[model samples]
Target: CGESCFLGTCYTKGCSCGEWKLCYGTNGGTIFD
Candidate 1:
């Protein structure tokens, strides 16, 4: 299995990947984004 879920992207309001590695809005994008 994958060590982590490196899926999802970033966007403005109304943007939610539901499985992002991190928060691109404030916490910051994923390690792959």
Candidate 2:
């Protein structure tokens, strides 16, 4: 599970699932393989 701050509210964000690519930060800046 992942969470992000939006409009000063904590929002629940979905994390990368099995075998899927994982990216992070604005513009999907970084990728994990």
Candidate 3:
């Protein structure tokens, strides 16, 4: 029930059980690395 992207991680308030709450990627896609 959230947005989708590559390289998922737990860095949002929507996380549960340490699950991925956000994503990272290239091309301004929430790149986290």
- Using all chains and alpha carbons, the TM-scores for the candidates as numbered come to 0.19, 0.18, 0.17
Which 10 successive residues of model 2 have the least lDDT summed? 16-25
lDDT (Cα, tens digit) per residue for candidate 2, span 1-33: 343333333333323332232322233554332
* Clashing residue pairs in candidate 3 (N, C-alpha, C atoms within 3 angstroms): none
Local error of candidate 3 at 22, Å?
Answer: 8.9
Error of 1 at 5 (Å): 13
List candidate 1 stretches off by more than 4 Å.
Answer: 1-11, 20-33
What C-alpha lDDT do the candidate models reach, one value each?
0.38, 0.33, 0.38
Q: Could you give candidate 1's per-residue lDDT for residues 1-33 as a string of tens digits?
A: 122334555344333444535433333443322
TM-score of 3: 0.17
Tens-digit lDDT track for model 3 on 1-33? Answer: 244534554344343222353433333343332
> Which candidate number has the best TM-score?
1
Better of 2 and 3 by TM-score: 2
What lDDT score is found at residue 2 in candidate 1? 23
